[PDB]
């Protein structure tokens, strides 16, 4: 549900983030830049530094992580 998810980070379906190649370290600044105000319908969990959404925005988000020479990890919710 987009309203619950964007509004509350509730009833999201995916939780994704950019990862540094090699180290696999999470890159919150890169994730942030691809989330929240920057991605319609998304919810930016600034704490965990992850990007949540109900609609399947994985491909779009991937293009952002990838534009920055990064990988992407996603969990299904």
């Amino acid at each position: 549900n987009n309203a619950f998810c964007a509004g509350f980070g509730l009833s999201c379906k995916w939780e994704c983030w950019c990862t540094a190649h090699g180290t696999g370290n999470e890159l919150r600044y890169a994730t942030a830049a691809g989330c929240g105000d920057h991605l319609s319908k998304s919810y930016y969990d600034a704490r965990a530094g992850h990007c949540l959404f109900s609609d399947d925005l994985r491909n779009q988000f991937y293009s952002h992580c990838s534009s920055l020479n990064n990988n992407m990890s996603c969990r299904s919710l």
Partner: protein
């Protein structure tokens, strides 16, 4: 301390320019030049350090930095 210009670069193959990473790091608040891919200080008094830029690059990618003195301020 003089003005420096820097690119974010890959930590692999020769360390090629990573333009979108440089662009992200540059907005530090300097200006980005599309053709040569460097971030420069907006004014000679308004410089960022090579060290600051390195941190900036690393916030956006697994990247290193190539920095040099900016000729327009030498």
């Amino acid at each position: 301390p003089r003005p420096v210009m820097c690119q974010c670069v890959d930590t692999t193959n020769g360390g090629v320019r990573l333009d979108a990473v440089t662009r992200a790091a540059c907005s530090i608040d300097g200006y980005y030049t599309e053709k040569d891919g460097f971030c420069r200080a907006k004014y000679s008094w308004d410089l960022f350090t090579s060290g600051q830029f390195y941190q900036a690059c690393l916030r956006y990618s697994h990247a290193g930095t190539n920095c040099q003195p900016d000729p327009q301020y030498e």
